[PDB]
Write a protein that binds this ligand. Structure first.
Ligand SMILES: Nc1ncnc2c1ncn2[C@@H]1O[C@H](COP(=O)(O)OP(=O)(O)OP(=O)(O)O)[C@@H](O)[C@H]1O
Ligand SMILES: [Mg+2]
Lengths: 48, 49, 50
């Protein structure tokens, strides 16, 4: 079920403000969010 | 052997994209978003490049 | 005859402009993507007004 959760969570998270680092020109890293090899690429959401 | 691969796609100062890099997958990359999200714009980026 | 023609065209254009402009208010700000409203623009063409 993990995937069907991740998507939904992201859908809920991106409506809440933006990430200021996205204008810095510095790409974000692919942080692992579990075992088995799942990864996420997103800057911290700062400006609400 | 060892087919070359497109690793990344960068958009700079475009409508909705000041500076955005997508890491192209080795097999499948899937853009997803509501109407007007700007996916056709990304494929436009790829082709025009 | 030419004057009468021009007059009848002007009257018909004015009537149709009024009808369409009244009709335009029959729309209520549809929400589609980044499109927030749809409207019909009717304007007499200067190239034809001359
Ligand atoms: N040449 C242009 N001039 C003005 N606005 C544009 C132009 N091209 C795209 N847009 C706007 O940019 C936004 C993204 O358009 P685009 O077609 O890339 O979206 P999309 O998410 O890929 O679309 P869809 O999923 O419906 O195929 C929309 O508001 C569109 O109106
Ligand atoms: Mg599109």
């Amino acid at each position: 079920r993990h995937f069907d959760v991740a998507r939904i969570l992201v859908d809920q998270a991106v409506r809440l403000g933006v990430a200021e680092a996205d204008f810095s020109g510095l790409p974000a890293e692919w942080l692992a969010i579990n075992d088995y090899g799942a990864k996420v690429q997103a800057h911290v959401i700062d400006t609400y | 052997i060892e087919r070359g691969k497109f690793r990344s796609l960068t958009l700079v100062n475009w409508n909705g994209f000041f500076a955005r890099t997508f890491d192209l997958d080795e097999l499948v990359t899937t853009l997803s978003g509501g109407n007007g999200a700007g996916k056709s714009t990304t494929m436009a980026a790829f082709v025009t490049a | 005859s030419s004057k009468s023609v021009a007059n009848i065209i002007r009257k018909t254009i004015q009537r149709e402009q009024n009808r369409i402009r009244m009709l335009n208010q029959g729309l209520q700000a549809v929400s589609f993507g980044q499109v927030r409203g749809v409207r019909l623009n009717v304007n007499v063409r200067e190239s034809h007004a001359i």
